[PDB]
Ligand binder design. Structure first.
Ligand SMILES: Nc1cccc2cnccc12
Ligand SMILES: Nc1cccc2cnccc12
Lengths: 158, 158
């Protein structure tokens, strides 16, 4: 009765890293929430290397090692989600990982831009989705990290 | 004779799809360039489905089927590349595909934003790269589709 026990792991994707505090406040909240459920956060800035390629490789490895990704696809520098987060969602999708997404703005892209085109006459997607359709996989788009985490707990038990 | 011959295939990732012509002018130029070298373009809008999930699945399948991705990481709706393209680059990276990227703007992110922070005091990466570090894998960032394609021809022969 001392079998190996898998500790669940979630990759914490999102532009919080670009906050003035490098994501400290966001990541601390994540750490506290996950601690209660014995889930390990895999955080992009953990044991951060100095070289871009090393940072990238470590983050890809975290995605490979995770049970799920919870991705913050909130508006970043406009109505579009963060590209880095989008890359990570793509990585996870290719590796058949559970991907859970949330955003602070759930309106359709055309509601966000107020038109079928942006200010430069570039087409805004019309699929009833809050962001680029590649980022949607059929799972509900959540309103917060917490709500996404509740789905994880219900659908990925120990 | 009459052994099976593999036709090389390149997934054409980029926000040209959002042009007023749905990328017609871009894709036509791509088709002509690749035709000369017996390379098949895998284009996001080819045989386009109506449902978001079907379009997504077909595009993921194209990446799975490709020999390389040439991704247009040009500024889209600001200094950041397109998120959908970023997702596709992520997918390709996880699948160990050759990923080739280009941009119309090769300046470092901090040169583009003119500061180490944006207008909202959000951190701009300082790794001497033109975009989010996740999008760089050690291969040169090219100036055009054509220059990326030249690398493909030199590094993925028939
Ligand atoms: N784009 C990025 C991905 C993963 C970690 C990072 C840490 N600092 C800046 C940018 C990052
Ligand atoms: N985001 C997208 C990915 C692949 C194909 C598309 C076609 N139209 C709009 C958006 C697309």
């Amino acid at each position: 009765h001392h079998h190996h026990h898998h500790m669940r792991k979630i990759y914490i994707a999102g532009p919080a890293v670009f906050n003035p505090d490098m994501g400290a406040s966001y990541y601390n909240k994540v750490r506290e929430l996950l601690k209660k459920e014995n889930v390990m956060p895999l955080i992009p800035t953990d044991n951060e290397a100095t070289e871009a390629l090393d940072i990238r490789q470590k983050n890809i490895q975290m995605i490979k090692d995770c049970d799920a990704v919870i991705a913050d696809l909130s508006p970043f520098r406009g109505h579009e989600p963060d590209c880095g987060t989008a890359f990570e969602v793509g990585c996870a999708a290719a590796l058949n990982k559970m991907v859970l997404t949330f955003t602070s703005d759930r309106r359709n892209m055309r509601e966000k831009y107020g038109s079928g085109v942006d200010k430069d006459n570039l087409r805004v997607e019309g699929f009833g989705l809050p962001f680029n359709l590649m980022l949607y996989d059929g799972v509900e788009v959540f309103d917060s990290f917490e709500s996404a985490f509740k789905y994880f707990l219900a659908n990925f038990p120990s």
